[model samples]
Target chain A: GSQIPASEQETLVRPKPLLLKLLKSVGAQKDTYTMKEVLFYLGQYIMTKRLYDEKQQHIVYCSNDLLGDLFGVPSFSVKEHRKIYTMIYRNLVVVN
Target chain B: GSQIPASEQETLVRPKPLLLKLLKSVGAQKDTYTMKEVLFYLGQYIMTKRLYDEKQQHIVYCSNDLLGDLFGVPSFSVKEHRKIYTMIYRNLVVVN
Candidate 1:
């Protein structure tokens, strides 16, 4: 098929106001991102900030208001990491 | 910058032989896919097969040899889903 595989194309998405604010704070300051890119930066934020709970390494403590507000929680388990992508998608709109 | 945002461009990747076999079983039959695409189809497989454990909805039972071997486990928690992606990446190589 001449058509490129859907997986081989970047799907650009725009973040909602809340996510925009969060992205700005992280110096991303961009209007759109691929979902993959968003998750990459979010991972970096967690890693850079050392958000992992010392006792339970799989849990990420929400050390900042923006992170907590985005997840609507104080902390979350990495087991539920897929839901984090879902939550991120909820705050994003596909670019036209 | 004329260069597209890294996230805006599709990053092609080739899956290892094992993952290729798994993809073929799912009828993807492709040499390469975006990481995002790979996860999308994997999610579909779990959803269509209803692989979630009844007692613990967060756990996915590795009901088949391919899945079990790929994850090296009998079951895994969805909370650890981020690790699934990491595992998938381990079986993938960036396309030249």
Candidate 2:
């Protein structure tokens, strides 16, 4: 079989908007639908979203400006923030 | 106490389920309990799960049947199907 293993390489190579939609859809809970909630949901959504997107080869590197645009937080590159994304993906994304 | 800097290398070495659980909790919404939702949750769950889990040293790799069992979508190794998982994760997950 010539199939490539669904791994990190593939995830870093796909489109961005569709990925965002999935995260939004998956993270959309019934209550707490505020702007902050949307941002928070998007925050959480982005992590698992990347995990699932791993096989597609899409890379996600964010600058402070982009992070601020999405999160509305000035200091968006802190450890806790990074940890939250990393932790969530590690727990979820299954590699082969 | 000396703490190791959390990085992608660290996340690849930890246990798997705990990482998945984090994805589930973070991605879980109040409604739409579809099988697709559960599997989709777990599927997308795996990506952000991996992202979050990355800092903690966890890895996930599943066989075809294994994914089938979890997702109830047999013959799940096709392209568009794979894209759904991939697209969602990429759009959602962020890297610093």
- Estimate, for each residue in B40-91, the C-alpha lDDT of model 2 and write its tens digit: 4565645653422232222232212234233322122222334334322332
Model 1 ranges with Cα > 4 A deviation: A1-9, B1-96
DockQ for every model, please: 0.02, 0.02
- Model 2 / residue A50 / CA error / Å: 32
Model 1 clashing residue pairs (backbone): A78-B79, A79-B78, A79-B79, A79-B80, A80-B79
Docking class of 1: incorrect
lDDT of 1 by residue, B1-96 (tens): 014334523568898898877776676767888766676667767776777766667666653547656654345555654456555667779887
